[PDB]
């Protein structure tokens, strides 16, 4: 009982508040997210796979803000500060991740449970 390797958890829905970090006048996190990583404009007639949008963290400023909040490499961010990113645009998303009204972005993300352990899994 308790944890069974080989069985997909599909998507762990967890909330994580990741806060931008001090770089002088800059408050920023320094991790990277892909909204488009493996896609194109041509899917939007369907939104990729319906409401997909293809938003997924592809890196992290390690030992920094995101990951300490509870973020890691390979995470699908669905919303920030409670703002469903799926129906909104990447620039719109950019706005509410890094404006001057927060100090932190509260995320609705989807975990695989396969956190940082450097697993080289690459399939094209």
């Amino acid at each position: 009982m308790s944890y069974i390797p080989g069985q997909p958890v599909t998507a762990v829905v967890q909330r994580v508040e990741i806060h931008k970090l001090r770089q002088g006048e800059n408050l920023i996190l320094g991790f990277s997210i892909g909204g488009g990583i493996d896609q194109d404009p041509s899917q939007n007639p369907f939104s990729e796979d319906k409401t997909d949008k293809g938003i997924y963290v592809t890196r992290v400023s390690e030992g920094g803000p995101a990951e300490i909040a509870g973020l890691q490499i390979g995470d699908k961010i669905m919303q920030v500060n409670g703002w469903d990113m799926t129906m909104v645009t990447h620039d719109q998303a950019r706005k509410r991740l890094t404006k001057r009204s927060e100090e932190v972005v509260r995320l609705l993300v989807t975990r695989q449970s396969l956190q940082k352990a450097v697993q080289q899994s690459m399939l094209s």
């Binding site: 996190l29 991790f31 939104s47």
Partner: peptide, 8 residues
């Protein structure tokens, strides 16, 4: 929708 990534 399309390929665009960003650090923040």
């Amino acid at each position: 929708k399309e390929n665009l990534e960003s650090m923040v």
